[PDB]
């Protein structure tokens, strides 16, 4: 199928010929002698941007059909009575008239529905609880297969939510063939690069330093549209490099024109232009790790090693495709930086972070929808990692009462057990600060393992942290060491940074005293 401009889906067409279009090419005589009617429609579902409309536009062109009537689902609806039904009915007149005129010697007509799930939903059986758009569904059902028969039509529906569609629309008489178009693998990604670079290769603007085979590996969860955007951005970067260099150096334009073919344009676009919707981001780690990771003690190494072991287990296991872990400790210990560091070091294609910072003012149902959307997206990859930050803040917990939201709690409890489709693997990391409440709620037995994140608990550790930060000098260092040599300290790193900043605002002479006073005012034992 790669000779029509579509690469990466050969089996999903090879099946489409057996189960749908075998009878449209076999000699008519034997087909009539059998007495078999043709298939009437098909349904396609998958993530957006993977080439469903393109394939639909080519299926028609392959059978010498007339120009397709493309319809968008959300646009049909209208507020007056009887308008949506009229719009639905208007897409079948030319096929009815042609059949009535020409009997069995008519052509073929194609109809392409986009976002079909927006106008067809399960009809309410309960009296008084009927849906708003039941009449549209009834009209469509009557038109597709009714008392008067049409034998010169084909219907192709495209969707992304195949579990919301009414059942009566999927019986063997209507839309009885179904296929899935998923994300491309390496081969599919090489073929789609060949197809989109054929033109530049023909016109001799593709340099020898550019290796498409290498570029295939660097794009892990890319779709077709994103690869096309990458190529276009590379061309634009080449043109910008040409114009800027020429305007700064007095060399002939033609020599520069030959120089726009470079590979540096490609690498520059792969970093600053294109942001995959199913890949790993690099703009969030900076937000969630603003001061790096300083190794002030042994516990950090223990935590990181445990994380590495969990990652390896989830990557190299067959009996446990799903794994969970909770990170718990006292406040200001730094549990959101360590969870981000582990996720970053995992090296999985798909890494996403769910936090309450982006759900301010949302009602509980909206939060449930957001979490469900993130997990549904995660299910489409072959290796996934997800991070749930706070947990006590997603539940709206407050000691008075107590009060909280039960809907989100139940959604989390159910989501922590559902496994992905066969062959795909997922990892989940949660961070809390109140584990007793979670134990009470009976959530703590849904996780598989727990890791404790301690606080600073000795003077020498504090001195090492200060040395690594590098803020006080030798004399102040000696003063502090002699004054806090007793190992009776209890402080969190994130609080230590704030204390240092606050201290550094005074005059040069009166700085150590203020720092010591602030430290003393702080607690000194659990």
């Amino acid at each position: 199928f790669e000779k029509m401009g579509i690469g990466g889906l050969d089996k999903e067409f090879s099946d489409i010929f057996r189960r749908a279009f075998a009878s449209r090419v076999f000699p008519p005589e034997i087909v009539e002698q059998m007495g078999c009617k043709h298939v009437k429609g098909i349904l396609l579902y998958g993530p957006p941007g993977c080439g469903k409309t393109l394939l639909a536009r080519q299926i028609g062109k392959m059978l010498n059909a007339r120009e397709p009537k493309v319809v968008n689902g959300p646009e049909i609806l209208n507020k007056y009575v009887g308008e949506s039904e009229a719009n639905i009915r208007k897409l079948f007149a030319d096929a009815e008239e042609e059949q009535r005129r020409l009997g069995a010697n008519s052509g073929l007509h194609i109809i392409i529905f986009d976002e079909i799930d927006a106008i067809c939903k399960q009809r309410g059986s309960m009296a008084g609880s009927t849906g708003v758009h039941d009449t549209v569904v009834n009209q469509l059902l009557s038109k597709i297969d009714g008392v008067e028969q049409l034998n010169n039509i084909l219907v192709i529906g495209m969707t992304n939510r195949p579990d919301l569609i009414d059942e009566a629309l999927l019986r063997p008489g209507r839309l009885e063939v179904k296929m899935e178009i998923g994300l491309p693998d390496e081969k599919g990604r090489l073929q789609i690069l060949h197809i989109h670079t054929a033109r530049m290769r023909g016109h001799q603007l593709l340099s020898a330093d550019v290796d498409i085979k290498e570029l295939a590996v660097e794009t892990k969860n890319f779709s077709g549209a994103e690869l096309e955007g990458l190529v276009r951005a590379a061309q634009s970067t080449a043109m910008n490099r040409h114009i800027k260099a020429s305007t700064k150096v007095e060399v002939d334009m033609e020599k520069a024109e030959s120089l726009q073919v470079t590979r540096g344009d490609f690498l520059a676009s792969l970093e600053n232009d294109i942001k995959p919707a199913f890949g790993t981001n690099q703009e969030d780690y900076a937000s969630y790790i603003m001061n790096g990771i300083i190794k002030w003690g042994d516990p950090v190494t223990r935590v990181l090693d445990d994380g590495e072991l969990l990652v390896q287990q989830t990557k190299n296991s067959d009996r446990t495709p799903l794994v969970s872990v909770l990170l718990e400790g006292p406040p200001h210990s730094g549990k959101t930086a360590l969870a981000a560091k582990i996720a970053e070091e995992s090296n999985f294609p798909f890494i996403k972070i769910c936090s309450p910072d982006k759900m301010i003012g949302f009602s509980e149902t909206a939060k449930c929808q957001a979490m469900k959307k993130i997990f549904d997206d995660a299910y489409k990859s072959q290796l996934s990692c997800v991070v749930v930050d706070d947990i006590e803040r997603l539940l709206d917990y407050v000691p008075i009462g107590p009060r909280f939201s039960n809907l989100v709690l139940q959604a989390l409890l159910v989501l922590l057990k559902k496994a992905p489709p066969q062959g795909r693997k997922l990892l989940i990391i949660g961070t809390t600060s109140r584990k007793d409440v979670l134990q009470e709620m009976e959530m703590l037995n849904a996780f598989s393992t727990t890791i404790h994140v301690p606080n600073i608990a000795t003077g020498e550790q504090l001195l090492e942290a200060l040395e690594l930060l590098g803020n006080f000098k030798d004399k102040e260092r000696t003063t502090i060491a002699q004054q806090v040599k007793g190992k009776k300290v209890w402080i969190g790193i994130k609080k230590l940074l704030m204390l240092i900043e606050m201290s550094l605002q005074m005059d040069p002479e009166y700085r150590v005293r203020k720092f010591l006073a602030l430290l003393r005012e702080e607690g000194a034992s659990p």
Binding site: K79, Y80, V81, V132
Partner: peptide, 16 residues
């Protein structure tokens, strides 16, 4: 959502 109710109409006459 309840579909909009029905409406009246106004007519204009032309002379040949």
């Amino acid at each position: 959502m309840a579909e909009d109710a029905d409406m009246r109409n106004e007519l204009e006459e032309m002379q040949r």
